[PDB]
Amino acid sequence: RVQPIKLARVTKVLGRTGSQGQCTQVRVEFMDDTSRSIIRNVKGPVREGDVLTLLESEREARRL
Amino acid sequence: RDKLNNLVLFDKATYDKLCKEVPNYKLITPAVVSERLKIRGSLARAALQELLSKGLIKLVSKHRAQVIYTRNTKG
Amino acid sequence: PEKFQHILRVLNTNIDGRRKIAFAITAIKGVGRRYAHVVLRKADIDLTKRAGELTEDEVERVITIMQNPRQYKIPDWFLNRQKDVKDGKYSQVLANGLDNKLREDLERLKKIRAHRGLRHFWGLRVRGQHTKTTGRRGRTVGVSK
Amino acid sequence: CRFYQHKFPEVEDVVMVNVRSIAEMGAYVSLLEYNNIEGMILLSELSRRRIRSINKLIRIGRNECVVVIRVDKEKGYIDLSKRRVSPEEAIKCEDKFTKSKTVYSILRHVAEVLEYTKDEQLESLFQRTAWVFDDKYKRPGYGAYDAFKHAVSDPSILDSLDLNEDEREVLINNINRRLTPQAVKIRADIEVACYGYEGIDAVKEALRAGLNCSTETMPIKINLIAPPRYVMTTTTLERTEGLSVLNQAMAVIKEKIEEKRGVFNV
RNA sequence: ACACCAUGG
RNA sequence: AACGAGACUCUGGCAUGCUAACUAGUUACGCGACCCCCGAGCGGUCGGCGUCCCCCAACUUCUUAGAGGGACAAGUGGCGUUCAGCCACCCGAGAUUGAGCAAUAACAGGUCUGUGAUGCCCUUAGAUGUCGGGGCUGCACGCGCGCUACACUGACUGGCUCAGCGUGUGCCUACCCUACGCCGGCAGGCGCGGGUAACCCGUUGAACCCCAUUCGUGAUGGGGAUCGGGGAUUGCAAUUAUUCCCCAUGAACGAGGAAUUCCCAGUAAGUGCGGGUCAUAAGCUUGCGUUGAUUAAGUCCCUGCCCUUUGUACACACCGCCCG
RNA sequence: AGCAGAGUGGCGCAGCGGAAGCGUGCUGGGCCCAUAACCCAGAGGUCGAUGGAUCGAAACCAUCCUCUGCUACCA
Ligand SMILES: [Mg+2]
Ligand SMILES: [Mg+2]
Ligand SMILES: [Mg+2]
Ligand SMILES: [Mg+2]
Ligand SMILES: [Mg+2]
Ligand SMILES: [Mg+2]
Ligand SMILES: [Mg+2]
Ligand SMILES: [Mg+2]
Ligand SMILES: [Mg+2]
Ligand SMILES: [Mg+2]
Ligand SMILES: [Mg+2]
Ligand SMILES: [Mg+2]
Ligand SMILES: [Mg+2]
Ligand SMILES: [Mg+2]
Ligand SMILES: [Mg+2]
Ligand SMILES: [Mg+2]
Ligand SMILES: [Mg+2]
Ligand SMILES: [Mg+2]
Ligand SMILES: [Mg+2]
Ligand SMILES: [Mg+2]
Ligand SMILES: [Mg+2]
Ligand SMILES: [Mg+2]
Ligand SMILES: [Mg+2]
Ligand SMILES: [Mg+2]
Ligand SMILES: [Mg+2]
Ligand SMILES: [Mg+2]
Ligand SMILES: [Mg+2]
Numbered sequence: 005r006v007q008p009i010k011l012a013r014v015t016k017v018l019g020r021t022g023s024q025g026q027c028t029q030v031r032v033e034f035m036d037d038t039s040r041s042i043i044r045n046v047k048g049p050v051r052e053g054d055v056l057t058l059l060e061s062e063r064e065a066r067r068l
Numbered sequence: 069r070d071k072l073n074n075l076v077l078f079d080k081a082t083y084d085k086l087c088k089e090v091p092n093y094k095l096i097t098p099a100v101v102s103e104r105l106k107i108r109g110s111l112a113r114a115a116l117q118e119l120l121s122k123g124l125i126k127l128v129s130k131h132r133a134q135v136i137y138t139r140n141t142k143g
Numbered sequence: 144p145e146k147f148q149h150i151l152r153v154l155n156t157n158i159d160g161r162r163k164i165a166f167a168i169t170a171i172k173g174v175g176r177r178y179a180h181v182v183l184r185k186a187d188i189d190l191t192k193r194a195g196e197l198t199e200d201e202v203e204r205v206i207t208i209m210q211n212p213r214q215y216k217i218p219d220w221f222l223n224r225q226k227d228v229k230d231g232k233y234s235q236v237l238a239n240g241l242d243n244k245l246r247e248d249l250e251r252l253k254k255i256r257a258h259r260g261l262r263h264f265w266g267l268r269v270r271g272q273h274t275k276t277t278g279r280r281g282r283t284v285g286v287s288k
Numbered sequence: 289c290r291f292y293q294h295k296f297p298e299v300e301d302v303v304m305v306n307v308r309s310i311a312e313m314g315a316y317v318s319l320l321e322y323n324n325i326e327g328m329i330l331l332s333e334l335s336r337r338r339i340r341s342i343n344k345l346i347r348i349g350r351n352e353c354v355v356v357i358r359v360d361k362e363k364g365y366i367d368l369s370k371r372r373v374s375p376e377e378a379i380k381c382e383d384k385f386t387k388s389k390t391v392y393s394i395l396r397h398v399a400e401v402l403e404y405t406k407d408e409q410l411e412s413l414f415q416r417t418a419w420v421f422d423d424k425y426k427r428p429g430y431g432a433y434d435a436f437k438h439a440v441s442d443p444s445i446l447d448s449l450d451l452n453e454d455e456r457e458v459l460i461n462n463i464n465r466r467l468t469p470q471a472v473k474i475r476a477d478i479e480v481a482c483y484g485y486e487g488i489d490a491v492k493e494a495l496r497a498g499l500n501c502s503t504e505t506m507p508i509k510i511n512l513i514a515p516p517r518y519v520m521t522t523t524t525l526e527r528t529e530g531l532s533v534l535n536q537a538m539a540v541i542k543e544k545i546e547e548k549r550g551v552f553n554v
Numbered sequence: 555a556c557a558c559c560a561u562g563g
Numbered sequence: 564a565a566c567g568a569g570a571c572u573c574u575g576g577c578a579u580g581c582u583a584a585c586u587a588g589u590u591a592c593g594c595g596a597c598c599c600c601c602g603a604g605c606g607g608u609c610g611g612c613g614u615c616c617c618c619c620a621a622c623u624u625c626u627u628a629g630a631g632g633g634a635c636a637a638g639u640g641g642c643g644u645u646c647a648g649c650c651a652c653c654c655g656a657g658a659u660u661g662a663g664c665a666a667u668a669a670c671a672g673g674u675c676u677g678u679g680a681u682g683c684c685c686u687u688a689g690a691u692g693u694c695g696g697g698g699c700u701g702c703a704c705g706c707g708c709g710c711u712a713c714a715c716u717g718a719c720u721g722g723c724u725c726a727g728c729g730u731g732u733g734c735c736u737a738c739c740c741u742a743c744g745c746c747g748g749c750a751g752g753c754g755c756g757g758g759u760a761a762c763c764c765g766u767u768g769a770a771c772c773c774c775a776u777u778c779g780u781g782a783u784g785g786g787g788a789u790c791g792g793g794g795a796u797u798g799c800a801a802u803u804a805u806u807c808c809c810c811a812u813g814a815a816c817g818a819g820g821a822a823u824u825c826c827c828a829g830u831a832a833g834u835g836c837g838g839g840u841c842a843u844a845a846g847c848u849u850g851c852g853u854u855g856a857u858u859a860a861g862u863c864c865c866u867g868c869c870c871u872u873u874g875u876a877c878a879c880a881c882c883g884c885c886c887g
Numbered sequence: 888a889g890c891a892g893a894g895u896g897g898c899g900c901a902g903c904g905g906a907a908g909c910g911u912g913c914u915g916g917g918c919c920c921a922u923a924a925c926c927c928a929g930a931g932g933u934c935g936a937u938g939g940a941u942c943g944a945a946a947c948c949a950u951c952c953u954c955u956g957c958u959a960c961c962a
Contacts, residue, residue, distance in 0.1 A: 025862025049859080069817070072780060077195055078160045092220050102779080109779040132775060133715085163777085166784060172809060176784075191777090220748070223811040232838040233793095241812080245791055258803065267702085269790070270804050274702050283929080285914050286705045338557065341926060343821090350908090393905055397942075399902070458942075465941040466904065489916085513889070514959085 008062040011035040012042075015056050021045055021067055029065065032056060074108040078115070086115055090124050091141075097139040149195030152204060155238045160195025163203075167194035173223055173237040174209065182208055185215045210237060289410045291321045291388045293419055297366060302355050303327075304385040305368065307348055317347055317368065321385050328365035329354055334370050345370075351383040363376070386432070391418055391432045397458045410520050420449070431498055440464045474530050475511070476537045478518035480552045495543045498522040499533045 012032035020028050027045045034040040035055070045065045046056065075082065084106050089104065098116065100107040116137060119125050129136040149160030156171050168179050183190060186208050188201050197205075208215045212222065212235055219225060222235050224244065228251075236244050253260035260271045268278065297319065298301050305317040314328040332343070340343060345502060353379070358367040403409045420433040422458060440460045441447050484490065498508045499522040511519035520537050524530060539554070546552055 020861060023864045025864095028861095032685080069780070069782085072783095074187065076149075076777080079146050098779090109776080111823095112779095113145075132773095163784090166778085171785090175811060175813095178810070218580080218748075220794075221810055222794065224599095225810080228792080235810080237679080238790095241791090245812085248791060262803085271700075271802095272804095273700055275700080276702090276706095278702080281703045283915055287914080343819090345925080383903080389905070395945090396905090400942085462904095462941060464945085465943095466947070 007062065011059040012056050012058055012061070014043075014046075014050060014052055014056065015041075017050065017052055018022075020041070023068070030056075033053065034061070074106045074107070076108050077111060077113070090119065091139055093139060094143075096106070096125055096139070097135065134141075145155070145196070147195060149193075151194065151202070153202070160193060160197075162194050163190075164188070164192055164194045164197065165190055168205070168209075171238055172241045173235055178221070178223075181217060181221070182212070185217065196200060209235070289392070289407060290323045290414060291392050291423065296325075296361055297324070297356050297359055299320055299356055299359060302353055302373065303368070304353050304381055305352060306351050307346055309353070310342070310346065311349055320351075321364065325366060327368050329368040333357065336371050350408050351549075353385075369459060372554060376524055387431050387433045391421070391436075391438075394436065394459055395463075398455060401454060407533060417450075419433060436463050437467055448513055453474040471527055472521070472524060472530070474521055474527065474534050476518055476520040476534055478538055479516060480518070480542060481516055481544055482548075482552075483550050484548055486548075487545065491541065491545050492543045497540065498537055500536075500540060511512055 007026075010032055014032050016029050016031040018031065020030035021027055025048050028050055030045060030046050030050055030061075031041055031043055034042075040044070043065050044063070045067075050056075077078050078086065085105065086101075093100070096116065098109060098112040101107060101112040102118065107115070113135075116125065116135070120127060120137065123135040125139065127135075128138050149161055151158040151167075153168070154173065158167050158170050160167070165179050165183055166176070168174055168182075169176055174182070182191075182205065186201075186205050187198070188205070208217075213219070213233060219233050221246050224232070224234050224236050226232075227234065228248075249260065249263050253264060259269055268274050303319050304321050305319050307315050307329075308318045309316055311328075314330045315334075317327045317328050317329060319325055328382075329346075335345060347464070351410055353372075353373060354368045354370050356366065356373045357369045357372065359365065360486055367516050379488055395410060395418065398413050399407075399410045402413070405418075418432050424430075425434055425518070435445050438444070440463055443460070446456070454485045480491075482490075496504060498520050499506065508517075508523070509521040513520070520534070520541060521530075522537070525533070542552060542554065546554075
């Protein structure tokens with residue numbers, strides 16, 4: 005329940021998910037060891053190269 | 069609404085407190101002086117122009133919709 | 144400065160000395176803003192004073208100019224009862240004569256039973272406005288029996 | 289002011305709140321068994337089964353009993369729930385609420401006469417007097433109302449510590465308009481059927497002997513609901529003392545009609 | 555991993 | 564092979580290149596003149612302000628409007644069966660302005676009250692073909708499009724400073740747009756001129772905005788309904804107030820329930836101005852400028868649309884059919 | 888006549904002293920091409936009457952009245 009914050013850099017834009025097409029699937033690396041990668045659903049207008057902040061990085065996105 | 073019963077002109081207590089606040093306030097505007105005491109807000113303008121005349125406060129900006137003063141350009 | 148008595152009781156109405164004179168005396172009927180400003184200018188008193196800052200030798204002059212305007216060169220096109228229908232006078236009717244004149248005018252109209260008096264009797268609109276979709280005071284009517 | 293010894297609400301407590309309005313994410317509410325801090329019930333946290341319209345199971349302006357799910361004492365946040373509210377908890381919550389409001393309303397004459405220029409008067413009076421009025425039987429199961437329950441039925445506690453001015457004659461008046469009267473129910477079942485003419489003045493030797501070993505004139509109830517079932521109740525006392533005086537009444541009154549002639553029910 | 559969704563001068 | 568799409572027409576953005584202009588201007592000085600030293604200086608010479616006056620001065624930058632030019636996914640890098648094409652970037656006035664026009668087939672859609680378009684039926688002199696008066700506006704109530712507000716990112720009072728699209732003397736039909744002088748607080752009146760118009764109103768001194776005063780959280784100096792009394796103009800006639808002006812009265816309304824409309828860049832919204840109807844007159848509509856955002860670069864969830872496969876007891880086509 | 892329960896919106900009712908709402912009915916809106924269902928708002932109160940306590944009640948106490956169930960059933 006106690007985890008620090010993790011900054012993650014976006015390296016690929018996959019597609020638009022959600023019922024209205026309202027959020028985006030994005031693949032990120034973890035700013036500490038580039039050998040890590042996860043998939044997240046981002047809410048805003050994400051480009052490639054941006055840095056997201058993760059309040060919970062042990063999760064992963066399935067879809068929707 | 070509500071009920072804000074402000075004073076139309078000073079009494080001696082408020083009148084001395086208005087001169088005992090001069091060194092204390094970093095920002096002086098009519099609205100702040102209205103909220104500190106119970107002043108009709110159009111009396112606060114006259115009070116601050118009077119204090120300014122006596123060199124007790126320093127004018128930093130005057131505009132139609134805003135006036136700003138500060139304590140003696142110090143601290 | 145000079146926390147003195149403020150609440151005034153001018154003829155048949157209460158003025159608050161907490162306000163400026165030109166907007167304090169408008170509390171009396173028949174006296175609006177355009178009238179009060181002129182009545183205060185003709186009386187040569189200042190216009191930045193609160194209505195409580197007037198001693199008993201100003202208020203009297205203000206009201207005696209307010210009640211006899213044509214004496215102090217207030218014009219005719221400016222008074223609220225001109226060519227008085229039944230006496231030919233020009234006057235400002237001020238405080239209680241206003242309601243009396245209004246009721247007397249309505250009763251005059253109803254007496255000869257003109258059309259304006261009949262619209263005033265039935266509580267309808269006296270000018271020529273449509274009444275099909277405005278006014279709307281009563282209650283909703285049910286259509287299902 | 290504050291209604292409770294605890295300044296802030298704690299986790300897993302049923303607070304009796306007032307729904308003040310509803311935002312896109314939750315009903316913001318006024319807590320009033322505490323100070324008047326703002327709280328939020330989340331719209332997801334509001335029911336377990338599907339809701340047909342919200343303007344039924346909440347209406348703005350109704351007090352209702354909702355549990356706490358999170359509190360942040362650092363910056364003043366309270367989160368609340370209605371999924372997590374039991375009917376048996378619903379039994380005790382407004383009990384606690386009304387029993388706290390009684391002690392808040394008794395602490396009014398004080399604010400009525402004391403330094404009501406500030407309301408810190410009532411806060412100080414609370415932390416002084418009402419803080420200690422409940423720490424003596426709280427876990428046993430009494431609030432701050434037991435002290436005043438005893439104040440007029442057995443005045444020894446208010447004088448066991450500071451007693452102040454013009455507050456006594458207000459509380460020893462008003463709580464004995466409401467809490468003090470005895471739960472009297474003990475109508476004795478006196479069933480007999482005699483076959484003698486003096487059978488009315490044969491029990492009259494005991495008709496005055498409802499309560500025994502006392503004064504002859506002490507007030508009792510003269511009852512008749514049926515010729516076969518006569519009825520008795522005596523000096524009221526408290527209902528276990530009432531049962532102690534009544535325990536043999538059905539028998540000590542019967543022991544006089546059995547002796548003349550005829551055998552009755554015992 | 556599927557709430558409700560009837561009828562027609 | 565044909566239609567529709569596209570192409571096409573008008574429009575907005577660019578040309579210091581062309582054509583050429585007292586019914587448009589610029590600059591120059593010929594000037595001449597006013598004014599102030601505001602500069603060296605003296606104040607003059609040099610300058611500074613001018614919608615003050617002239618040029619048979621030189622020119623077309625601004626204005627006008629004609630002819631041509633110019634943008635093509637043309638250049639460069641990626642992605643593409645290396646095809647059709649897509650993304651990014653340099654250069655550029657611009658790399659996706661806005662409208663007009665629009666198919667086969669159809670609807671018992673609207674219009675007989677636009678018509679000297681029209682079939683049939685009715686009436687036709689006690690007319691269903693003309694004058695006077697009333698109505699189309701009446702008010703317990705239900706609904707639609709809208710105007711003004713709920714104030715301090717404001718109201719009031721002064722000062723300052725900027726537009727564009729238009730219209731303008733009428734034949735029957737009798738009326739147009741106004742300058743400037745005087746008179747009146749105001750609406751308005753009298754007197755003399757210009758314009759059939761890039762010529763006169765007009766350099767269209769527009770509003771919001773900008774700069775200073777008074778107000779002070781109070782249904783208040785917010786709001787302007789309702790109503791009393793008076794003064795003008797149009798007209799043959801103003802009462803059921805035509806419109807306009809003045810003093811007075813001073814209602815609801817403190818941001819709006821369930822629902823629901825419109826919108827992607829000079830766009831939404833704020834703001835004023837013209838045309839239409841108009842003897843009189845816009846809270847309407849149709850065009851024009853002025854200040855000028857937040858949010859998107861997506862999806863098929865909701866409402867619908869297009870194409871393919873599939874199912875059907877429907878074809879008056881699911882608002883269908885049909886069982887007890 | 889007696890016991891017990893109840894007396895609150897047209898109707899069924901909730902309401903352990905800081906004091907008027909729920910469910911149904913009624914009227915008008917919403918949603919739909921339209922009707923039912925469903926959503927919203929409005930209207931309608933001597934809290935049975937009379938006194939008393941209480942700082943204060945619809946609520947507590949006392950008297951009376953009116954309904955309902957059950958025995959009593961009574962010259
Ligand atoms: Mg259906
Ligand atoms: Mg049926
Ligand atoms: Mg059927
Ligand atoms: Mg059918
Ligand atoms: Mg072919
Ligand atoms: Mg290429
Ligand atoms: Mg460039
Ligand atoms: Mg185009
Ligand atoms: Mg077509
Ligand atoms: Mg036709
Ligand atoms: Mg025909
Ligand atoms: Mg017609
Ligand atoms: Mg004719
Ligand atoms: Mg006629
Ligand atoms: Mg009509
Ligand atoms: Mg329409
Ligand atoms: Mg506006
Ligand atoms: Mg217009
Ligand atoms: Mg015109
Ligand atoms: Mg017009
Ligand atoms: Mg129209
Ligand atoms: Mg829609
Ligand atoms: Mg297609
Ligand atoms: Mg098929
Ligand atoms: Mg068939
Ligand atoms: Mg069907
Ligand atoms: Mg059948």
